[PDB]
């Protein structure tokens, strides 16, 4: 018979993005008090990643939950707070993300 292979169900990664004059190449969703992006999770998510853009080249994938940006935690953050964090993250945007499978 066959056996289920080793499966990674969850990841927490640290990704470093190099912003271009155009920007990061993502779109974020969610926030405390907002219509949650996934389920009831009012956290911040990556809803879009531009192909071969900075975030793309850095390992970001659609659906990543955004937990922290350059040492600024986003727990319980509203959408605009996360927006202001990223707008000012600067050239090098080091984000910690959470990632499921499937």
């Amino acid at each position: 018979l066959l056996i289920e292979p080793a499966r990674i169900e969850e990841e927490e990664l640290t990704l470093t993005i190099l912003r271009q004059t155009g920007g990061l190449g993502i779109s974020i969703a969610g926030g405390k008090g907002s219509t949650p992006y996934k389920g009831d999770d009012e956290g911040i998510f990556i809803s879009r990643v531009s192909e071969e853009g900075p975030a793309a080249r850095a390992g970001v994938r659609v659906g990543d939950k955004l937990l922290e940006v350059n040492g600024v935690a986003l727990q319980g953050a509203e959408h605009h707070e996360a927006v202001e964090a990223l707008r000012g993250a600067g050239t090098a945007v080091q984000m910690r993300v959470w990632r499921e499978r499937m």
Partner: peptide, 8 residues
């Protein structure tokens, strides 16, 4: 309320 597409 629904803010799902703030592009950056």
């Amino acid at each position: 309320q629904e803010e799902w597409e703030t592009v950056m």
